[PDB]
Amino acid sequence: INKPWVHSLLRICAIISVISVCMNTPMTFEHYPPLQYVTFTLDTLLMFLYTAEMIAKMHWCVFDGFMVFCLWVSLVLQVFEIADIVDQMSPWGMLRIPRPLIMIRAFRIYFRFELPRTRITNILKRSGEQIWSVSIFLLFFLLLYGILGVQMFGTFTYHCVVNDTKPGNVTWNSLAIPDTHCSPELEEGYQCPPGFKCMDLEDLGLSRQELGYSGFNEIGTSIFTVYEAASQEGWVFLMYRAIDSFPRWRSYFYFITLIFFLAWLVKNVFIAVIIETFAEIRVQFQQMACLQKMMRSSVFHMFILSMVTVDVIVAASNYYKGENFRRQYDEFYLAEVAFTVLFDLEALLKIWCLGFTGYISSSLHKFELLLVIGTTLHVYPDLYHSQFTYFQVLRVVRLIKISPALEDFVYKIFGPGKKLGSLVVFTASLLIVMSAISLQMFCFVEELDRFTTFPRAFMSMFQILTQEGWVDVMDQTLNAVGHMWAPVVAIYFILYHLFATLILLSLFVAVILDNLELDEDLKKLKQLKQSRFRNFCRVVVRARFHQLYDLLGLVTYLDWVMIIVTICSCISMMFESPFRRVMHAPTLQIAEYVFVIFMSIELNLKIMADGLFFTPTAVIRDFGGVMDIFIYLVSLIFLCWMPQNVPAESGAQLLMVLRCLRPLRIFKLVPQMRKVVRELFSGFKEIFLVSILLLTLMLVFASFGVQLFAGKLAKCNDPNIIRREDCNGIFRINVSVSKNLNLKLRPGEKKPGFWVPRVWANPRNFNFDNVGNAMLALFEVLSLKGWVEVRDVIIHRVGPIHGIYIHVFVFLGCMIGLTLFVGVVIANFNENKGTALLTVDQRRWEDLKSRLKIAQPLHLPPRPDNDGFRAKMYDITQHPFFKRTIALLVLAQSVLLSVKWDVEDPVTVPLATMSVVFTFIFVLEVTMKIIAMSPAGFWQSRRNRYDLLVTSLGVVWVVLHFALLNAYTYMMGACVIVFRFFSICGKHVTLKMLLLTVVVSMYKSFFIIVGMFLLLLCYAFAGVVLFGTVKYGENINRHANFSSAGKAITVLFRIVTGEDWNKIMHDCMVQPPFCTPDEFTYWATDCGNYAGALMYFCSFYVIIAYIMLNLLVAIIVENFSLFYSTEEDQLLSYNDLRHFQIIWNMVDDKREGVIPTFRVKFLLRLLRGRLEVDLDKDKLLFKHMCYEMERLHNGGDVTFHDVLSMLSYRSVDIRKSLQLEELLAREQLEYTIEEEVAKQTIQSCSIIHSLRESQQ
Amino acid sequence: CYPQGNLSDFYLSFCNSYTLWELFSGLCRQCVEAYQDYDHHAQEKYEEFESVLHKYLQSEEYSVKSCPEDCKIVYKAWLCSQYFEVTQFNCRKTIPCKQYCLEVQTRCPFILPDNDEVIYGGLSSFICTGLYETFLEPECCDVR
């Protein structure tokens, strides 16, 4: 195998082998008989060349041996299959499950990095340990919410059926339309009206496959449902079912907290882990004549770009007129031919001028000539409006050259092509391999059309990757295979979803961010480069007031009055409705009047105090003042007008909608919210350029869709009719009863439905007839919500080939396009905070400084000696075995909540009793420390405070339970178990660090959450006034409404997660003849607002999801690196600081926190482990550290933090971790110490001391 | 005023909005029994519609202007118009019968059709106009 070509051919043949196994499918052979054999013709060839290649090497290779064995096995299986002795629909096909892995050989030689593989092994060690930590964190959260759901909810099997219904015969015609859950109580949940009765479907002989899988029956089902909801997929409907079945507050608290904690923060911890992985990569990689002159004219370039613009616009302007208007030689065809000739002449003249050699050398000209070739072929009648049109619609990319700022921003954000190129190649390869594996796994299962061919398997895997409806794919696949293999199939699907959503989508964000950052070289070099009556108003305006005194002096008295007045006006506006108007309800006008009058005064009191313009501190100086006076004028005009009749789509309604911007005064009256707005808008330029890139992508694909999908999505709503000629008359359509129940229909039963007209119409939610329709459809697809509907409609009504069109966009617009927003937001956040120009080492030094500042001495008392009692029990308490045993007991007690503690149920009585024992056990534990360390010492630790609290609650529960015994006692016991389970985060190191990260991120995110809530409140008022009375449609239902401010707030919060937000948008766009309009008022009409709804929903979704929601991500990515730490060779480890605290308590019997300067030598001599300062071999470091702790103060006893900072400085390369100022100061101080000790003459620490001295 | 069980005094059982005079003028055992058979078929279809509509628990909330009463009235009108494509002459108030279609989708709730053999993509169960088509000829009574 000395030939070099053999390796290239073997890579090509590995690709061909994966291609062949992807095609070895039963249905593929059924639809194409000959393939059945060509596959056998490939393997037999490959299987030889591979076999002959291993023996030739014999006379990582274990992988090659196993794969050639797999090829042999597959070929023998296919031999027997062609013989008809083994059924093609048999599970034997699974014998080819490993074959796709041959694809690894195709991209194996490219694993040759520029560094020793030890660096890669260590990087992956670190990253995998952190991934395991965050996975344990996610498991903890999932188990917590699972037990919470099992205890707060039950089995959602109570549905309303028709009055007279008996068990066994429950059918489709028994449920309501749509199916509705209910409550057996009288004041809890939903009560369905007369004619219907609430009954348990599971009691009526109904299997659970028919009911579904998601629920809170037991711990496993609850954890499954909680993980499904954590992906923000179908959680709002689960919430609706819960609100119907059980009290509302339970569902609200539960699901909103689950979305806030699990779906956001805990899921951003993985993004933070991958970002730190890239940072560690960067770190470890740093530790080493007439026509020639005219052609170049600016006017000619401008002319060519103008012609490209005209071409794209003319091509996209060919909207659908009707079946009576279109030709293959239309006028648009002639215009496109003319533009093609023009640009071909343009390219050929460039070639004649600069010569093909110099012309083709440019990448831009490479792309230009590729477009020329593709468009000259596209103008061919047989290729017009086909898949070649892509080339044409790519001409717009040329326009990117008109703005050099956008060009440089593209070059920057996309960075070196290698990174994101390899990421894209890996994504494609992994998708192909997983699709092939799932294919060969389910290619034979009957009644499952999701993996019957490789295209469908790839579509399924892509759907799981996009998270839109992956639960449906999993449920279908599980129902397909027997209940015996359902668990393993579910585990496989869950593992794939986890790896695809928490690693790959995070890898994209990490790559984009890393490209948005400067490299360490340029960072270092750049940091090296830059080394009367007016007096009364004045007094009343400028007059103002621990931290309580700081909060009271946060703003002026007038600003405080304005804040309170604004909050009061907002609370009052929360009560306004389409039927309780502020114009007709005097009780609601009070606040109104106030807000006006007061505000007026304020304005005057400020105007007369600071003028309005051309002064240093004017009133209308910023955009904030302009917004303030705008709000004031709107409010005053509305108050003076108070129109009693507000027609829809009128000026009065616009005034009312503008009046909903009142909550934005809090952005200007509160300094922290002003800071939020400023820090967010400091990156508006990059946000705008990313928006322009996304708009260019959407324009390209919308032009393509309009030329290829115009008028071709319409169809007859009767599935039996095929031609538009027979789409007339009436037919019996089936109504959607339930999409969660799989109740099969009987042979002698008719599905519920009714007779309707036959119509040839498009989908109500999307179409490609105009450029605007296509642009809006693609904007909706960009959210990955309801895009599977568009995919299926395009694959069915247009053709399967066009399935490419929808899959490329979703990849370039979502996996890459929307990632850009995340990267830009996080980069602007880091820049504002001031850590963007610091190298990774400097960031880690800052994080270490913070961690050592927040650290305090380990205040645990010493081990007694006078008493064998306390000494023995102390030795027994602080033993790690005892600690881990108590941790296991805490983890096991929570398993008692696996079943709902119920008085109606007997299984509760044992469980509860068991828990009692647990409680008693815990008492003993606590009690023994109260004997080991004395109450004074036991109360020293803030964790033991929580332990004693929960143990006392548990004792109280035991008493009240074996004294009263009722439902309230069981609820109390469940709460006690939940608290003692939450206590487990204090037993585990990394779990504690991660929960610290999460809680501190929640704390530091307070003002961002408050600003998001203010924007949501403005939008909620605007929506209550716009769509307050909109006819119920697809998603506007009893749950999703704008009739109240609370209903609007909740539906907007749902929209933040994107859960079918476009459906709600299209519901609020309803206009006649689908609704009854009114000429007088807007609250007397069931119509919506088309443009109003578009603006409202699109702007809200953009602003919240694509921008502000990422602000939290950033914060996480920050506090993560601030709290999580791993053992390194350059800084202080958690082990190091714990050992330092231990030795500090050992050398300082006192607890004053200060140690005499002569006892510092004792501390150093006593310091062992990774910080030992050997006096036999390193006397100089010891003397220097002692003199430093003796000089810090003129003989004064030092502090714990003082010695800790000394050790921190002495344990890292100052030249690579500190900045100019601090580096110079520290080197000066250290050399002063050194030379002073010299004159007075007459491990991490040791290793860096060697570095320092040798370098000197 | 003689519901069958001058021909302009004999209306049909279910489609009360039509008279034998109107039927014979547009569309005696021969045709009379066929008209009553069409009436029975329309009655069956309308009973099916009522069955589907009574299972709509959001009947008193889907619209602030429309109730199930007007929806049922206009739907029965549209059904009878589709079964008897004739023109009425004794009506005191006229209406283009095609308009009834619109009225249905204007006054009846949004029933979601099932998505198994076809993806409707937000389309209602009852629709009148297709892709770019002039909806609106016969003239019927205004029983609204």
Ligand SMILES: CC(C)CCC[C@@H](C)[C@H]1CC[C@H]2[C@@H]3CC=C4C[C@@H](OC(=O)CCC(=O)O)CC[C@]4(C)[C@H]3CC[C@]12C
């Ligand atoms: C990018 C390179 C490195 C690998 C990309 C993989 C494709 C080049 C190969 C691998 C599997 C092949 C597919 C295997 C299975 C199918 C189904 C096969 O038969 C059917 O589509 C019948 C299904 C039906 O229409 O009912 C048509 C070829 C196709 C799309 C093949 C197209 C080419 C594919 C996608």
Ligand SMILES: *[C@@H]1O[C@H](CO)[C@@H](O)[C@H](O)[C@H]1NC(C)=O
């Ligand atoms: C309604 O469901 C039945 C199955 O009982 C099916 O035969 C029929 O085609 C469906 N109707 C439509 C319009 O899809």
